[PDB]
């Protein structure tokens, strides 16, 4: 809900949201756990969450009754709502890890500028990011805006004149309006807290301030109106800090077609033209990339070297290894075809699938080359003769493993039930990769071996 | 009690009458805070957010929690009911079962394929023995490295199953071929056949280690996930 | 000996002593540290355009640099060669006695009139039905300036005149202490004496310190400059 | 309780942040101070860091900062916990016959359920969604 | 509380001059108010957005609109040091001696935060220098209690 | 090494006779000559 | 100090004990609360 909105107002929306899920999604939804008062961006009276629990996967058949479909319908249905941003969304696979898409930026007060000038600098940064939709999308603050607040000034002179102590004033105000934890007591053998607070009806509006009285030294009761003045101002309901300094967290992501590294490189540029004393830093997911970014190539640079060296020792040749190593794309192409065909992503299951697809195709190539080489080295046979005899011998075992392993992962591709997202990501990249790795290697490996041996006499 | 707090003496007046705390205040057992309103299908609610202990079995714990909640059933007041809006245990029970089905089905498929080509029950048993030995053995290595049975490590084995199946098939097939082509007895055929491939298999282990082992040395959260697959696949492949 | 455990065991025992110590000692902050006795390095700070005094520089270091260096891994202890500013109320006994006041009256008024009050909310939970307004109440907040401390009303006389704090004291921003005063090649300076945490790597910590200082340099005032008058690490790098 | 975001920041959050020194393997620190009187400082550590050591070091530096915090905050208590936000399950507890409020249910669960679930085999941690009872004195200013 | 009224409040606060222009064309309610009683003009006066103050007054905004505690856009502009807006509001008929529920005027607020230029402007448009608040305090009393030397010289014209 | 130090004895009887608190005496002596950390304030956003 | 065994048990011993959950390698926990206010809570762990 908007800023300044009350608990009741929020409850009305949550009741409407709950009423939708039990009526319109009656066949899918088992329960709706409505939590008025808590939101991830910042808790308060004007926010809430409804945790929707569904019936068993057996009672929700087909794509139409999955979370993807129900989410879309709910979000579309709740675009109607009277001034309230209400939207449904699925949980990420690892809730521990968070959402983990895009970037996590921190705008930092580096020179005691204060909340208001940091807000201005943040708005300057957001407005600049909005002028690059080609690179940046959904660039937003992960925090709350300023809200109206009631500034009350205790007049010290008038308090001293009437003989009212400031401790009695500030305790009367705080205890009544804010509550006060006095001490503990023992309810049925369990220690529990004792709070004093004003009954709801005497702590609601500015006129209720004047109904509270404080005893002076002389004995007379003095109302708050006698020694106070008040006015409306704006202030923060959620102040953020990062590494000890005032901050404002900015979330966002790279635009379609762009990498997060490009989007980060732009946000740094746009930050460098912000006002004096306004710095920045990367946190969370972005911190880990910024530090551990150059690893992915640097590790597999060594992998490629060790592979070459191992094959060199196996075959006793600096050149022959290349015939094996040229197999790598043959599996990768089919994986990429099978993934792109189905509209899946380049995820960890797919990526580990590539390494297993590559390794098995590499293994096949190693044995084809080994057989060919031994026929040449021991039996004195010619290049083409040995290559043809080698690939003949290895055709059957290659076809057997591929037949079994493609049929083994076949159910993981077609699977639509519980945990099917992961199974699909494992299955498709393996199946498609195995189909091309099998078909191509039997014809291409002899080509690689022959071409390499001719090139290096 | 609320009665005792009500009887707290605030002052004694001049006329004699006593001002007690219940005169200037309502008194009740309430909540500590009133910011959160929790409901479950419109009805008032509370609950227990339960986390798994370090190194504990998630399925045992869930069964154990449900067992303890059952013992509490008889003593609840009228209207009180237990409900389970969030529970990872149904999902984890399915994830493991589907992986176990795939590994068993993979072994029967190899049996069907081995018989289709080689055409005797004797040879098709040899992978059916060797693959379980390697799979079981991998769990022992996972236990030694302090790893758990989880979604990532389980799919790590499903991805590895092609490499395990291949080691079994390559060895047996190559004996069946050497027996067919040269006519040597099984014992001598196996010596010659293993002579053709033992050097290669050792080279394949090193090469495959170099493909998978670097995946363990990624940093941060992404690298923790990659390391689960890496250790599982390197262990399975090394035993095979 | 594991220094992490040594610190834990020592601090477990210190905690038993803490309540027995004077209130004033507890409020200065007791600290348990695991560091080498000798300085790893001294990070000096000067103003090359003479625009800030020894006192200004030291405050800048204390308020903008020290804490982040202190939080850096490997940094056992950080000695500020100088003092952070505090609000200094410099009392006058002649003027105090003139208005029948003592240091006890000054202390009470500073507590009463430089206070950060928790005041609750308009329309706060649990609310009445049909509430539309929800807003924080802001009462007294901490004072921010010598002017505000100056106008702290100590008392009102019989004839109606006001005794403010500035009428009985000079009020200025100045060191918590005035004991440490540093110079670099004759000119005013401050700095940070950094000690290596027990068993940490000197070169890695120095590198982390030099990285953390690089993040601060862009936001310095005019003329402020880091100098490096003492560092034990470069000899290690050069000798190797 | 009853504190605005700035009051929390300037009496609690800054004071704690200033004392988070000499703790090993800290990558970064972040905090929020809000108008429901709450502060949360999160300290994220390097991968491979012992979580127990990380926690005790933070806990110990907080203890020494406690005398600097306000009376009311000392009284409520400042909790240092590992942030392993990953629930095994959530057990809901509801009332069908309209006889109990959420406060009544929460107290029943605190007194007759929570402890036994905490002592159950394999259970690492248990969070009450709500509070046990409190003695509420709802004051009337007209009568006062 | 119309649909465009809420968007004008949010736009006037944020200083989005182009969105205010469009909302003026479409007839968004210039007298729309918060729960606390703040019009777009209050919001523009507070956050210091000059162009919008001028745009709202062209479109018939109440220059002497008062919030739930009696405060006007001139109170807000004078207190937060927005000289240009103070002049514009006074030029468009703002009550220079407007009192909130505490008896606080724009002069008292301007004085209290030492906004010298604004105090002179308010005086030039006929600010009552002897105006007392609920505690009997003039703007002069504020200047000597704050210890403002220069301000006290200006206001000592009884 | 040891050094001269100014030893001062508060007469308890004479203090009780005049009606002067020993807490007011020690606070006065200590705060004036030693210094007293009263409470915190905010200097350009930082608690000091 | 001055609290009986039952008051001590209710206010200290149980409060501490219900927070001694999910500690690694805990075999058993024993404790006692006495008439001199004293609480002792001993937690014994798995061997190794
Ligand atoms: C960045 C940090 C540092 C990391 C370190 C990285 C180290 C990587 C390891 C690289 C090792 C490569 C060593 C190869 C050196 C070439 C030796 C070949 C000698 C040669 O010319 O072979 C001839 C036969 O030709 C043939 O049959 C052709 C054989 C030679 C093929 C040449 C291609 C070498 C490919 C290696 C680079 C690629 C690796 C990555 C994929 C006859 O031999 P001779 O000795 O009689 O000749 C002397 C004539 N008078
Ligand atoms: C044939 C079949 O269906 O698999 C069954 C059979 C199964 C593979 C079992 C898991 C596990 O005990 C297996 C081991 C290796 C356990 C250790 C040894 O004692 C073996 C002698 C035993 C044989 C097979 C068995 C008994 C199954 C499971 C998994 C059960 C776990 C969950 C979470 C449902 C399954 O049902 O998938
Ligand atoms: C051909 C060989 C192939 C290798 C196959 C490898 C098998 C790996 C499968 C996982 C092994 C462990 O799986 C084991 O399953 C049983 C199911 O009775 C679980 O048992 C638990 O869950 C069940 C089902 O909810 C509860 O009713 C029970 O109270 C609880 O103890 C164990 O906690 C778990 O340890
Ligand atoms: C730092 C450690 C890691 C380094 C990387 C090592 C990678 C090496 C891969 C394994 C290669 C095995 O090494 C290979 O073994 C086979 C037999 O098994 C040998 O092959 C030979 O075996 C015997 C040797 O007496 C002969 O009688 C026989 O005629 C011939 O087949 C090859 O001459 C050798 O090259
Ligand atoms: C000498 C032949 C046996 C060599 C052992 C090969 C298996 C190595 C596995 C490597 C795993 C890291
Ligand atoms: C068989 C060894 C494979 C090489 C792994 C790469 C290790 C990189 C460590 C920096």
Asked if residues C106 and C168 have their Cβ atoms less than 8 Å apart, the reply is yes
Alpha helices in chain C (DSSP H): 3-17, 23-28, 54-64, 66-71, 93-98, 103-113, 146-150, 202-216, 233-239
- The answer to whether the CB of C54 falls within 8 A of the CB of C234 is no
Q: Which residues pair with A215 in a beta bridge?
A: A221
User: Tokens at residue C52, please?
Assistant: 């800030």
Q: Token pair for residue E148? A: 């403002």
The owner of tokens 């055709």 is A395
CB-facing half-sphere around the CA of A81: CA atoms within 13 A:
22
Residue C195 three-state SS: strand
Q: Which atom of ligand 1 is nearest to the CA of A325?
A: 41
For residue D10 the two structure tokens come to 């300037």
Report whether C134 contacts C124 (CB < 8 A): yes
CB C104 within 8 A of CB F27: yes
Q: Which of A312, A269, A297, A259 is nearest to A135 (CA)?
A: A259
The residue among A439, A453, A438, A433 whose CA lies nearest residue A322 is A453
CA separation for the pair E145, A157 (Å, rounded)? 11
Contacts with A176 (C-beta within 8 Å, 6 or more apart), sequence order:
A197, A198, A202, A203, A212, C120, D139, D141
| D131, two tokens | 């509070």
* DSSP 3-state of C47: strand
Look up the CATH number of the domain holding residue B101.
1.20.1640.10
What is the helix, strand, coil percentage profile of chain G, to 5? 25, 30, 40
Query: What spacing in Å lies between the alpha carbon of A370 and ligand 6's midpoint?
Result: 25
> Do the chains contact at E147 and C132, CB–CB below 8 Å?
no
| List of domains in chain A | 1-96 (3.30.70.1430), 97-146+243-291 (3.30.70.1440), 147-235 (3.30.2090.10), 292-457 (1.20.1640.10)
CB G43 within 8 A of CB G23: yes
Which of these, A402, A320, A327, lies nearest to A369 by C-alpha position? A320
Helix (H, G, I), strand (E, B) or coil at A104: strand
* Residue recorded with tokens 């060296």: A309
Neighbours of C189 (CB within 10 A): 22
First to last CA, chain D: 22
Could you say which DSSP state residue C145 is in?
S
Categorise residue A114: left if φ over 0, alpha if ψ from -120 to 50, beta otherwise.
Answer: left
Neighbours, chain D (3 or more CB pairs < 8 A): A, B, C, F, G
Q: Report the length, in residues, of chain C.
A: 240
Beta carbon of B206 within 6 Å of any ligand 4 atom: yes
Helical packing angle, A420-455 and A383-408, nearest 10°: 180
Q: Are the beta carbons of A28 and A60 closer than 8 angstroms?
A: yes
Do the Cβ atoms of A8 and C117 come within 8 Å?
no
CA distance B188 to B179: 9
- C-alpha–C-alpha distance, residues A22 and A55, integer Å: 12
Characterise A138 by phi-psi region: left (phi > 0), alpha (psi -120 to 50), beta (else).
left
- Residue D19 DSSP code: T
Interchain pair B40, A288: CB under 8 A = no
Q: Which two tokens stand for residue C88?
A: 């200094």
Distance from C-alpha of C176 to C-alpha of A346, rounded to nearest angstrom: 58
Q: How far is CA A207 from CA A159, A201, A228, in A?
A: 20, 11, 13
Q: Which contacts of D70-79 are long-range, i.e. CB under 8 A and separated by 24 or more positions? A: D70/D11, D70/D12, D72/A180, D72/A181, D72/C118, D72/D1, D73/D11, D73/D12, D75/A181, D76/A181, D76/D1, D78/D16
Would you tell me how many other CB atoms lie within 10 Å of the CB of residue A67?
Answer: 15
CA distances from A114 to A236, A246, B55, C199, E78 (A): 12, 8, 47, 39, 21
G22–B54: do the CB atoms touch at under 8 Å?
A: yes
The DSSP code sequence of chain B is -HHHHHT-EEEE-SSS-EEETTTSEEEEEE-S--S-EEEETTEEEEEEEEEEPTT--HHHHHHHHHHHHHHHGGGPPTTEEEEEEEESHHHHHHHHHHHHHHHHHHHHHHHHHHHHHH--HHHHHHHHHHHHHHHHHHHHHHHHTT----HHHHHHHHHHHHHHHHHHHHHHHHHHHHHHHH---HHHHHHHHHHHHHHHHHHHHHHHHHHHGGGGG--HHHHHHHHHHHHHHHHHHHH-
**E151 with E123: CB under 8 angstroms?**
no
Count the Cβ atoms, other than its own, within 10 Å of residue C234: 12
B71 CA from centroid of ligand 3 (Å)? 24
For chain D, where are the alpha helices, taking DSSP H only? 5-8, 14-18, 51-65, 71-76, 102-112, 114-118
Q: What would you measure as the largest C-alpha separation in chain C, in angstroms?
A: 80
* F chain contacts of residue C28, beta-carbon cutoff 8 Å: 37
Please state, as a whole number, how many other Cβ atoms lie within 10 Å of the Cβ of residue B174. Answer: 23
**Count of structural domains within chain E:** 1
H or E element, residue A286: helix A284-291
Quick one: resolution in A?
A: 2.5
Q: Are A434 and A331 in contact (CB under 8 A)?
A: yes
Helix (H) or strand (E) holding A150: strand A147-154
Q: Which CATH class is domain C36-82+179-231?
A: alpha beta
* CA proximity to B162, closest of A368, A426, A371: A426
A431, HSE (Cβ side, Cα atoms, 13 Å):
19
| Residue E134 CB coordination number (10 Å) | 18
Q: Which of B82, B154, A114, A209 is nearest to F42 (CA)?
A: A114
Contacts by E115-118 with C-beta closer than 8 Å and gap 24+?
A: E115/E78, E115/E81, E115/E83, E116/E150, E116/E151, E116/E154, E117/E83, E118/E78, E118/E81, E118/E83, E118/E86
C-beta separation of B123 from B110 below 8 A: no
Closest ligand 1 atom to residue A322 Cα is 41
State the alpha helices, DSSP H only, in E2-48.
Answer: 3-14, 17-25, 40-47
- What is the phi/psi pair of residue B25, to 5°? -170, 145
Which of B170, B171, B172, B142 has its CA nearest to residue B157? B142
What are E's interface residues with C at a Cβ cutoff of 8 A? 35-36, 145-147
Instruction: Give counts: helices (H), strands (E), chain G.
Output: 2, 2
Nearest CA in chain G to B54: G24
CB contact under 8 A, C151 and E147: yes
C-chain residue closest to F26, CA distance: C104
d(CA C198, CA C209): 16
Best probe of the D interface among C8, C17, C65, C71, by most D CBs < 10 A, is C71
Rounded distance, CA E61 to CA E78, Å? 19
A109 Cβ contact list (under 8 Å, min separation 6):
A117, A118, A245, A246, A247, A277, A278, F45
Q: DSSP letter at E56?
A: H
Q: Name the CA radius of gyration of chain G, rounded.
A: 12
**How many angstroms separate the CA atoms of C156 and C145, rounded?**
23
Chain A residue with Cα closest to G16: A191
User: F42 to chain D: which residues are within 8 Å by CB?
Assistant: 10
Please state, in angstroms and as integers, the Cα–Cα distance from residue A104 to each residue in A101, A128, A138, A141, A286, following that order: 9, 17, 12, 10, 6
Distance of alpha carbon A72 from the chain centroid: 19
How many angstroms from the chain centroid is the CA of residue G36? 15
Residue nearest to atom 35 of ligand 2 (CA): B97
B203 touches ligand 4 (CB under 6 Å) = yes
Rounded distance between C-alpha atoms, residue A187 and residue A178, angstroms: 24
Atom of ligand 2 nearest to the CA of B96: 33
Q: How far is G15 from chain D (nearest CA, A)?
A: 10
Give me C21's structure tokens. Answer: 């110590």
CB E106 within 8 A of CB E96: yes
Beta carbons of A344 and A350 less than 8 angstroms apart: yes
CA distance C133 to C135: 7
Give the C-alpha distances (Å, rounded to integers) separating A248 from A5, A77, A207, A239: 23, 33, 35, 8
Distances (CA, A) of A412 to B103, B113, C155: 12, 19, 83
Number of residues that make up chain F: 48
Contacts of B58 in chain G (CB under 8 A): none
The domain of E145 spans: 1-158
Query: Residue holding tokens 């319908």?
Result: A73
Query: How many other CB atoms are found less than 10 A from the CB of residue A140?
Result: 12
Binary contact (C63, F43; C-beta < 8 A): yes
| Touching chains D and E? (3+ Cβ pairs < 8 A) | no
- Is the CA virtual torsion A329, A334, A335, A339 positive or negative? positive
DSSP state of A159: H
Distance B227 CA to ligand 6 centre (A): 13
Nearest alpha carbon, ligand 2 atom 21: B136
In this structure, are residues B178 and B189 in contact, taking their beta carbons and an 8 Å threshold? Answer: yes
* E48 cis-preceded (ω within 30 degrees of 0): no
Q: Which of the listed residues B217, B227, B233 should we mutate to test ligand 6's pocket, taking the one with most ligand atoms within 8 A of CB? A: B217
Q: Are residues A244 and C67 in contact, defined by beta-carbon separation less than 8 angstroms?
A: yes
**Residues C105/A280, Cβ–Cβ less than 8 Å:** no
Q: How far is CA A96 from CA B154, D50, E99, in A?
A: 19, 18, 56
Contact between residue D14 and residue F46 where contact means Cβ atoms under 8 Å apart: yes
Question: What is the spatial distance between Cα A187 and Cα A1, in angstroms, rounded to a whole number?
Answer: 38
Residue C194, beta-bridge partner list? C41, C78
- Nearest chain E residue (CA) to A5: E35
With CB atoms and an 8 Å threshold, state whether A307 touches B207: yes
Render A215-253 in DSSP notation, one character per residue.
E-TTS-EEEGGGTEEEEEEEE-SEEEEETTEEEEEEEEE
C7 touches chain D (CB under 8 A): yes
Does the Cβ of B20 fall within 6 Å of ligand 2? no
CB C144 within 8 A of CB F41: yes
Tell me which chain D residue has its CA closest to the CA of residue G23.
D124
Collapse the DSSP code of F35 into the 3-class scheme (helix H, G, I; strand E, B; otherwise coil) and give the result: coil
The 10 Å Cβ neighbour count of residue D30 is: 20
Cβ(C118)–Cβ(C233) below 8 Å: no
Strand partners, C86: C174
Q: Could you say which DSSP state residue A177 is in? A: I
- Contact at 8 Å (CB) between C6 and D56? no
Distance of CA C81 to the CA centre of its chain: 13
Question: Do the bridges between strand G26-33 and strand B18-20 make them parallel or antiparallel, or are there none, so unpaired?
Answer: unpaired
For residue B18 the two structure tokens come to: 């006593």
Distances (CA, A) of F31 to C86, C95, C107, F19: 15, 16, 9, 21
Centre of ligand 1 to C-alpha A453, Å, is: 15
Which CATH number is C83-178 given?
Answer: 3.30.2090.10
Size of interface A-F (CB pairs under 8 A): 7
Contact (CB, 8 A) for C26 and C17? no
Positive or negative CA dihedral for C8, C12, C18, C20?
Answer: negative
Cβ(B216)–Cβ(B226) below 8 Å? yes
| Chain E residues with CB-CB distance to A148 below 8 A | 34-36, 38
DSSP, collapsed to helix, strand or coil, labels residue A109 as strand
How far is residue F6's CA from residue A337's CA, in Å, rounded to a whole number? 92
Residue A175 burial class via C-beta count within 10 angstroms: exposed 0-12, middle 13-18, buried 19 and up: buried
Asked whether the beta carbons of D104 and B46 are under 8 A apart, the reply is: no
List residues in chain A touching E: CB distance below 8 A: 2, 4, 83, 123, 148, 155, 157-158, 206, 229-232, 234
Q: Which residues contact C208 (CB under 8 A, 6 or more apart)?
A: C72, C73, C74
| Ligand 5 atom 6 nearest Cα | B202
Q: Determine the atom of ligand 3 nearest the C-alpha atom of B100.
A: 5
* CA–CA dist A120, D33 (Å, integer): 20
SS3 C45: strand
Query: Residue with the nearest Cα to atom 2 of ligand 6?
Result: B210
CA distance A427 to A421: 10
Q: What is the biggest distance separating any 2 CA atoms in chain D, rounded to whole angstroms?
A: 61
Q: Which ligand is nearest to the CA of B204?
A: 4
Please choose, from the candidates C125, A32, B70, B43, the residue with its C-alpha nearest in 3D space to the C-alpha of residue D99. Answer: B43
Tokens 């080279």 found at: B203
Q: Is the CB of B89 under 6 A from ligand 6?
A: no
| Beta-carbon count within 10 A of A25 CB | 19
The experimental technique used to determine this model is: X-ray
């Amino acid at each position: 809900l908007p800023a300044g909105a009350t608990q009741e107002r929020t409850q009305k929306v949550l009741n409407e949201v709950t009423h939708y899920y039990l009526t319109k999604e009656k066949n899918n939804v088992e329960s709706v756990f409505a939590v008025n008062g808590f939101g991830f961006a910042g808790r308060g009276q004007n926010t809430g969450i409804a945790f929707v629990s569904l019936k068993d996967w057996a009672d929700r058949p087909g794509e139409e009754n999955k979370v993807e479909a129900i989410t879309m319908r709910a979000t579309r249905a709740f675009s109607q709502i009277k001034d309230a941003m209400v939207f449904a969304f699925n949980l990420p696979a690892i809730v521990e890890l968070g959402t983990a898409t895009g970037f996590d930026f921190e705008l930092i007060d580096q020179a005691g500028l204060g909340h208001e000038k940091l807000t201005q600098a943040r708005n300057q940064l957001l407005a600049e990011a909005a002028k690059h939709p080609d690179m940046l999308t959904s660039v937003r603050p992960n925090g709350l805006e300023d809200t109206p607040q009631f500034k009350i000034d205790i007049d010290q002179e008038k308090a001293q004149a009437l003989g009212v102590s400031i401790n009695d004033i500030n305790t009367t105000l705080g205890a009544a309006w804010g509550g006060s934890y006095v001490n503990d007591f023992i309810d049925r053998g369990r220690v529990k807290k004792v709070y004093v607070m004003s009954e709801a009806k005497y702590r609601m509006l500015p006129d209720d301030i004047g109904d509270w009285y404080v005893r002076a030294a002389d004995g007379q009761m003095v109302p708050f109106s006698a020694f106070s003045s008040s006015r409306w101002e704006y202030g923060s309901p959620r102040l953020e800090r990062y590494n000890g300094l005032p901050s404002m967290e900015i979330l966002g992501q790279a635009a379609p077609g762009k990498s997060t590294g490009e989007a980060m490189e732009l946000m740094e540029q746009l930050a460098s033209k912000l006002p004096t004393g306004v710095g920045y830093d990367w946190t969370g997911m972005s911190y880990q990339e910024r530090l551990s970014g150059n690893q992915a190539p640097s590790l597999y640079a060594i992998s490629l070297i060790v592979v070459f060296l191992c094959l060199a020792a196996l075959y006793e040749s600096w050149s022959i290894p290349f015939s094996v190593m040229l197999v790598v794309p043959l599996g990768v192409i089919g994986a990429l075809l099978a993934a792109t065909f189905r509209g899946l992503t380049n995820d960890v299951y797919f990526q580990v699938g590539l390494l297993t697809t590559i390794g098995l195709s590499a293994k096949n190539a190693i044995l084809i080359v080994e057989f060919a080489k031994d026929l040449m080295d021991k039996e004195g046979k010619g290049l083409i003769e040995a290559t043809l005899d080698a690939v003949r011998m290895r055709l059957r075992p290659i076809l057997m493993t591929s037949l079994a392993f493609i049929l083994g992962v076949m159910p993981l591709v077609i699977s639509t039930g519980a945990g099917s997202g992961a199974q699909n990501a494992v299955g498709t990249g393996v199946m498609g990769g195995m189909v091309t790795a099998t078909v191509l290697a039997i014809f291409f490996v002899p080509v690689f071996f022959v071409v390499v041996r001719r090139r290096f006499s | 009690s609320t009665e005792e707090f009500g009887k707290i003496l605030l002052k004694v007046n001049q006329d004699g009458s006593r001002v007690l705390l219940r005169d200037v205040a309502k008194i009740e057992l309430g909540g500590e805070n009133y910011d959160i309103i929790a409901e479950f299908n419109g009805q008032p609610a509370s609950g227990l957010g339960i986390k798994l202990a370090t190194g504990a079995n998630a399925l045992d714990t869930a069964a154990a929690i449900r067992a303890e909640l059952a013992k509490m059933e008889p003593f609840f007041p009228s209207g009180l009911k237990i409900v389970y809006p969030y529970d990872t245990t149904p999902f984890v029970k399915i994830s493991i079962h589907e992986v176990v089905k795939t590994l068993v089905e993979a072994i029967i498929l190899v049996f069907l394929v081995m018989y289709l080509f080689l055409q005797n029950f004797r040879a098709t048993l040899i992978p059916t023995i060797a693959v379980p030995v390697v799979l079981l053995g991998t769990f022992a290595v996972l236990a030694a490295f302090g790893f758990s049975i989880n979604t990532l490590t389980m799919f790590g084995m499903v991805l590895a199953i092609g490499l395990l199946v291949d080691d079994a098939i390559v060895v047996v097939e190559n004996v069946e071929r050497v027996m067919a082509e040269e006519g040597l007895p099984p014992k001598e055929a196996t010596r010659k056949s293993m002579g053709q491939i033992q050097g290669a298999l050792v080279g394949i282990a090193m090469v495959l280690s170099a493909v998978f082992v670097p995946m363990a040395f990624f940093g941060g959260s992404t690298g923790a996930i990659y390391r689960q697959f890496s250790i599982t696949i390197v262990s399975a492949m090394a035993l095979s | 000996t594991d220094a992490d455990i040594a610190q834990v065991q020592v601090q477990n025992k210190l905690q038993l002593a803490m309540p027995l110590l004077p209130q004033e000692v507890q409020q200065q902050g007791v600290s348990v540290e695991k560091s080498s006795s000798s300085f790893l390095m001294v990070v000096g700070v000067i103003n090359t355009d003479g625009t800030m005094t020894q006192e200004d520089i030291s405050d800048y270091v204390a308020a903008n640099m020290k804490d982040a260096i202190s939080r850096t891994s490997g940094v056992g202890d950080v000695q500020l060669f100088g003092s952070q500013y505090a609000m200094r109320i410099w009392m006058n006994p002649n003027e105090l006695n003139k208005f029948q006041l003592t240091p006890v009256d000054v202390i009470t008024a500073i507590k009463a009139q430089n206070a950060q009050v928790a005041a609750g909310q308009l329309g706060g939970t649990p609310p009445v039905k049909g509430q539309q307004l929800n807003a924080s109440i802001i009462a007294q907040t901490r004072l921010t300036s010598t002017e505000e401390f100056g106008k702290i009303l100590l008392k009102v006389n019989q004839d109606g005149s006001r005794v403010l704090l500035r009428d009985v004291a000079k009020i200025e921003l100045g060191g918590e202490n005035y004991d440490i005063i540093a110079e670099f090649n004759g000119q005013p300076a401050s700095g940070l004496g950094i000690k290596l945490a027990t068993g940490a790597n000197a070169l890695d910590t120095a590198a982390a310190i030099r990285a953390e200082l690089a993040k601060m340099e862009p936001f310095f005032p005019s003329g402020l400059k880091i100098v490096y008058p003492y560092d034990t690490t470069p000899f290690v790098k050069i000798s190797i | 309780p009853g504190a605005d975001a700035k009051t929390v920041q300037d009496t609690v959050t800054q004071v704690i942040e200033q004392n988070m020194n000499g703790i090993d393997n800290l990558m970064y620190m972040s905090s929020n101070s809000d108008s429901t009187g709450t502060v949360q400082i999160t300290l994220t550590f390097e991968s491979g860091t012992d979580a127990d050591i990380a926690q005790v070091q933070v806990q110990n530096k907080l203890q020494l900062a406690m005398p600097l915090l306000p009376q009311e905050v000392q009284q409520q208590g400042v909790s240092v916990e590992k942030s392993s936000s990953s629930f095994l399950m959530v057990v809901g507890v509801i009332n069908t016959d309209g006889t109990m409020t959420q406060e009544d249910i929460s107290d029943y669960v605190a007194a007759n359920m929570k402890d036994a679930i905490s002592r159950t085999s394999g259970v690492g941690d248990v969070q009450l969604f709500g509070s046990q009872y409190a003695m509420r004195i709802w004051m009337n200013p007209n009568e006062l | 509380g119309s649909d465009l009224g809420k968007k004008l409040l949010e736009a006037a606060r944020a200083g989005r001059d182009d969105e205010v222009r469009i909302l003026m064309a479409n007839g968004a309610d210039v007298n729309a108010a918060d729960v606390v009683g703040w019009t777009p003009l209050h919001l523009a006066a507070y956050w210091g957005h000059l162009e919008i103050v001028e745009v709202l007054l062209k479109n018939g905004a109440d220059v002497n609109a008062y919030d739930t505690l009696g405060s006007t856009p001139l109170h807000l502009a004078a207190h937060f040091g927005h000289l240009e807006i103070v002049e514009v509001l006074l030029k468009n008929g703002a009550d220079v001696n407007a009192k909130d529920d505490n008896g606080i005027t724009p002069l008292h607020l301007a004085a209290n935060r030492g906004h010298l230029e604004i105090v002179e402007v308010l005086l030039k448009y006929g600010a009552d220098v002897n105006a007392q608040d609920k505690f009997g305090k003039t703007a002069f009393d504020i200047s000597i209690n704050n210890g403002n030397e220069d301000l006290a010289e200006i206001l000592q014209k009884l």
